[PDB]
Amino acid sequence: GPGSENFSVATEESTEPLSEDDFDMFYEIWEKFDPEATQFIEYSVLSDFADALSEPLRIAKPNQISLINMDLPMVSGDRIHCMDILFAFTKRVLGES
């Protein structure tokens, strides 16, 4: 066996504010607006989706002003992609401003 008891110089345990339960909750609520699993929704229902989540991924209604102030893309000029919505919603929690 090695010396100096602990024998290492580093660790592998990550440090972030989110958990697996946040992403599971996101995908559970996502299916209510994209039951076809296309990975897209319209901006006309993005505000209902934003209010359907649990905290912290929630943006409590009225939320249209918050969505307008995000750097959210569009894929068509009227729809948005699942991962890009997720990113814009977690950006607040992560403190990336």
Tab-separated table of C-alpha atoms in Angstrom, residues 10-80:
chain	number	residue	atom	x	y	z
A	10	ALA	CA	-6.722	16.311	-5.299
A	11	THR	CA	-10.471	15.357	-5.207
A	12	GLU	CA	-13.299	14.559	-7.741
A	13	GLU	CA	-16.454	15.770	-5.837
A	14	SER	CA	-18.136	18.605	-7.878
A	15	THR	CA	-19.567	21.882	-6.390
A	16	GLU	CA	-22.649	23.441	-8.128
A	17	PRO	CA	-26.079	24.867	-6.941
A	18	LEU	CA	-28.220	22.410	-9.055
A	19	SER	CA	-28.916	18.622	-8.665
A	20	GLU	CA	-30.327	15.682	-10.741
A	21	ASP	CA	-33.832	16.402	-9.277
A	22	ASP	CA	-33.896	19.883	-10.975
A	23	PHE	CA	-33.261	18.386	-14.466
A	24	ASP	CA	-35.763	15.520	-13.782
A	25	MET	CA	-38.403	18.169	-12.787
A	26	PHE	CA	-37.571	20.210	-15.964
A	27	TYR	CA	-38.081	17.173	-18.298
A	28	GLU	CA	-41.277	16.067	-16.395
A	29	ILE	CA	-42.886	19.533	-16.934
A	30	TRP	CA	-41.440	19.796	-20.531
A	31	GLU	CA	-43.622	16.825	-21.694
A	32	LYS	CA	-46.790	18.916	-20.879
A	33	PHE	CA	-45.881	21.404	-23.715
A	34	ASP	CA	-43.874	19.043	-26.038
A	35	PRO	CA	-45.653	15.614	-25.745
A	36	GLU	CA	-44.322	14.880	-29.305
A	37	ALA	CA	-40.719	15.069	-27.852
A	38	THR	CA	-39.618	17.332	-30.832
A	39	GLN	CA	-37.348	19.345	-28.420
A	40	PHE	CA	-39.182	22.628	-29.409
A	41	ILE	CA	-42.010	24.885	-28.069
A	42	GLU	CA	-43.501	28.243	-29.262
A	43	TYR	CA	-42.737	31.616	-27.548
A	44	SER	CA	-46.584	31.849	-27.118
A	45	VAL	CA	-46.392	28.936	-24.531
A	46	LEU	CA	-42.819	29.533	-23.169
A	47	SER	CA	-44.409	31.839	-20.488
A	48	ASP	CA	-46.822	29.062	-19.386
A	49	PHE	CA	-43.865	26.559	-19.336
A	50	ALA	CA	-41.752	29.079	-17.299
A	51	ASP	CA	-44.635	29.257	-14.713
A	52	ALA	CA	-45.267	25.424	-14.686
A	53	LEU	CA	-41.824	24.511	-13.182
A	54	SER	CA	-40.779	24.270	-9.515
A	55	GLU	CA	-38.166	26.666	-8.055
A	56	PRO	CA	-35.370	27.523	-8.803
A	57	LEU	CA	-36.005	26.847	-12.577
A	58	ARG	CA	-39.441	28.594	-12.221
A	59	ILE	CA	-40.055	32.172	-13.405
A	60	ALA	CA	-43.354	33.047	-11.636
A	61	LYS	CA	-46.092	34.620	-13.873
A	62	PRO	CA	-46.213	37.432	-15.028
A	63	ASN	CA	-42.842	36.437	-16.606
A	64	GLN	CA	-43.063	37.801	-20.230
A	65	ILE	CA	-40.830	40.830	-19.322
A	66	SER	CA	-38.195	38.428	-17.824
A	67	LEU	CA	-38.264	36.250	-21.018
A	68	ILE	CA	-37.946	39.426	-23.224
A	69	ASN	CA	-34.860	40.491	-21.142
A	70	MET	CA	-33.157	37.026	-21.577
A	71	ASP	CA	-30.720	36.358	-24.481
A	72	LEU	CA	-33.060	33.493	-25.695
A	73	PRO	CA	-32.582	32.454	-29.403
A	74	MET	CA	-35.251	31.315	-31.909
A	75	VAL	CA	-35.015	28.358	-34.398
A	76	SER	CA	-37.818	29.577	-36.787
A	77	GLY	CA	-38.635	33.177	-35.695
A	78	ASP	CA	-41.413	31.770	-33.364
A	79	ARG	CA	-40.042	28.553	-31.608
A	80	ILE	CA	-37.156	27.858	-29.156
